[PDB]
């Protein structure tokens, strides 16, 4: 009770941290072992007010620390991690804020379980946006 | 930094070493004195730069030949290093490894059927090529 379980010292509680680290934004989302129930979600867009640094490591680590103190407020100790890119037909790589948010969570008194990639990879996608001539800049 | 000798001093040092090798030596101060008369060098700075380099090359040629060549040095270097002169020739082995394929080659040459050579079991596997591509 009291915003946490009654688990003894012998066993620790495992959360799940979805790090949707794309370009232009990074999501850190802590949930239970099914993901059905959520504890906290903080993103760079709601942490920086410059509209450009939504994917910056500066805003990403601040998001990670905020969900970290909230997780400790709920007594969450261990944390399996699911890293996720944009996926689909678009980019399949994590953005800049993945490593900063990951490092911030470790250094904020949290424990780390297993990191796995849940990036959506199509067998073969639909027509990707941009035309056949690419994005001529 | 900045003490690199130029081709002017370098080449002139080599020529006077070859032409006057016995009149030189290991001492810089004697080398500059012989250089005063064995060649006409106008500048003092150029002179003792030449002598300084000559002293350095004397320390090198005394313990091994260089790009420069002395006719006396060549004969002495072939006169030395005559041989390791082992008490027996290095290739008078009492037993010599011989494959069966080479053994029949000597038989077809008619020079086989000797005692010194011994035949070995042919290696098995026929794997002698490196796997192709990267790694």
């Amino acid at each position: 009770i009291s915003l946490g379980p009654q688990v003894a010292e012998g066993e620790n509680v495992f959360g799940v941290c979805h790090i949707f680290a794309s370009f232009n934004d990074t999501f850190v989302h802590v949930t239970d072992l099914s993901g059905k129930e959520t504890i906290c979600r903080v993103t760079g867009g709601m942490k920086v007010k410059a509209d450009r640094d939504e994917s910056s490591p500066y805003a990403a680590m601040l998001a990670a620390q905020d969900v970290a103190q909230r997780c400790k407020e709920l007594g969450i100790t261990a944390l399996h991690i699911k890293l996720r890119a944009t996926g689909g037909n678009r980019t399949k790589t994590p953005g800049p804020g993945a490593q900063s948010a990951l490092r911030a969570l470790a250094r904020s008194g949290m424990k780390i379980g297993r990191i796995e990639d849940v990036t959506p990879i199509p067998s073969d996608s639909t027509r990707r946006k941009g035309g056949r001539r690419g994005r001529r800049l | 930094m900045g003490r690199v000798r130029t081709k002017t001093v370098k080449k002139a040092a080599r020529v006077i070493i070859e032409k006057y090798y016995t009149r030189l030596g290991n001492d810089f101060h004697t080398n500059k004195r012989v250089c005063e008369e064995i060649a006409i060098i106008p500048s003092k700075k150029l002179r003792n730069k030449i002598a300084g380099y000559v002293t350095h090359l004397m320390k090198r040629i005394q313990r091994g030949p260089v790009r420069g060549i002395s006719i006396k040095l060549q004969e002495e270097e072939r006169e030395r290093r005559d041989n390791y002169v082992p008490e027996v020739s290095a290739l008078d082995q009492e037993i010599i490894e011989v494959d069966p394929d080479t053994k029949e080659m000597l038989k077809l040459l008619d020079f086989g059927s000797l005692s010194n050579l011994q035949v070995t079991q042919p290696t098995v596997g026929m794997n002698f090529k490196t796997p192709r591509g990267p790694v």
Binding site: Q99, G113, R128, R132, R136 | -
Partner: protein, 102 residues
Amino acid sequence: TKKRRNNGRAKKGRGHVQPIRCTNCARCVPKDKAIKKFVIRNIVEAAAVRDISEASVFDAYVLPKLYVKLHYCVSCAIHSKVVRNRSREARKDRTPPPRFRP
């Protein structure tokens, strides 16, 4: 003037190759022509590998990797400096560049 014997693409017994898309600009480029780069990346960069290993609950955990195969149109591969222009003689060399292992 024919710059390359293979026309810059590895098409010898075919007539048509299905197109893939550049990951950077999303440009339709033939699969035999695009620069392919299979990259294995650490999930945790070197700046945080110690933090994650220490904070990990597991006594011994090997960080998994990323297995993504990258396709670049030659414009984007040149801009990203994946491929560099070479001299006429050095163009013919097809061995991959050294990994700089030692």
